[PDB]
A paper describes a structure:
Bacterial secretins are united by a common C-terminal secretin domain, which oligomerizes to form a large pore in the outer membrane. During natural transformation, the T4aP extends and retracts a filament to take up DNA cargo.
Here, we present the structure of the [name] T4aP secretin [name] to ~2.7 Å using a fully functional, His-tagged allele that we express and purify from the native bacterium. Once assembled, VcPilQ forms a 56-strand beta barrel. Inside the barrel, two further beta hairpins (beta strand-turn-beta strand each) form a gate. This dramatically reduces the channel diameter, from 90 Å at the bottom of the N0 domain to 60 Å across the N3 domain. In our VcPilQ structure, the inner channel distance between the corresponding glycine (G439) alpha carbons is about 8 nm.
Author numbering:
A (entry chain G): 365 to 571
B (entry chain K): 469 to 520
C (entry chain F): 417 to 468
D (entry chain K): 365 to 416
Write the structure that this text describes.
């Protein structure tokens, strides 16, 4: 009879509180309630397991004259607030495009020397700047000079990434018992993998 | 530019832009633009098509 | 526990500078010349820059 | 009799909650409710497929 407010202390009731914290987690819960002798006992399990894949391909092309610069673009132009000269603001435009920029050169033994820029940018989140806000950009860029045979492909570069995370929180001695331990612990595990590649292939137009 | 052997040299710019969303700039807003652009110099016979 | 691996690659010509990048560009509020603001972009990228 | 507020815990009721999240998704739902022995069971399917 000691405490005043009595509907149910749902949070003070629980002994072990290690629920799977997600929005798509599925659960199931069992109970034994007498209320004659007073005894009550509750047990809930919850779980989640998901998985994902993705793949993107993009390929621009150009035709041009030997020793002559060419470009092709597709994207957006972000208006930024101010550009500064001697005194005042010429507000300007940053680019977020998928672009190819190239200057070629033909050599005697059936080969090309290429001065290459290839980018793929997008519009990102809107961050906080001073008392204002502005838009950020997500980029991928590669710039090189290479030497490649007439009609075949070379890989200019790439990036590979991998990551693994594990975590446990348990009860100091019980969360290690061989089969019962799963009643005294929360377990989390995550793995990711990513891969990017860039190819190029030139060709001389033989009329 | 017209050349002797029935051919043209073209200095080309072709674009197709549109008005995009209105983004946030400082304490203000402004309008963004969506673009497609190609600029080249090519050499093409008198009355036929090429893909740029 | 945790473990991360990242590996960029490049091919280039002898004595010639090359770079490869992946990340974001943060717009910062103002850059100062003789009088006014050219607001600029700082980089937060995973990058390789090399001359062999 | 333990909880105070009782109309129906529609969110605490469900075991598996993996509904197709869209605005044009179509569903269908079956039920078996006794209320004499207490047993209740619900099952709903939902789907969507579009093309452009």
């Amino acid at each position: 009879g000691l405490l005043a407010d009595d509907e149910f202390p749902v949070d003070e009731f629980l002994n072990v509180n290690l629920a799977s914290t997600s929005a798509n987690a599925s659960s199931i819960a069992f109970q034994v309630a007498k209320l004659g002798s007073g005894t009550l006992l509750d047990l809930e399990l919850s779980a989640l397991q998901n998985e994902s894949k993705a793949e993107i391909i993009s390929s621009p092309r150009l035709i041009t004259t030997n020793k002559q610069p060419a470009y092709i673009e597709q994207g957006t132009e972000i208006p930024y607030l101010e550009s500064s000269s001697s005194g005042a603001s010429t507000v300007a435009f940053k680019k977020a495009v998928l672009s190819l920029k190239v200057t070629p050169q033909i050599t005697p033994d059936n080969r090309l020397v290429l001065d290459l820029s290839v980018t793929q940018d997008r519009r990102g989140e809107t961050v906080k700047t001073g008392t204002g806000e502005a838009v950020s950009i997500d980029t991928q860029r590669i710039g090189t000079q290479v030497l490649v045979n007439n009609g075949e492909t070379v890989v200019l570069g790439g990036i590979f990434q991998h990551s693994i995370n594990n975590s446990v929180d348990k009860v100091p001695l019980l969360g290690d018992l061989p089969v019962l331990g799963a009643l005294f612990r929360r377990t989390y595990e995550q793995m990711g993998k990513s891969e990017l590649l860039i190819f190029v292939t030139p060709k001389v137009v033989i009329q």
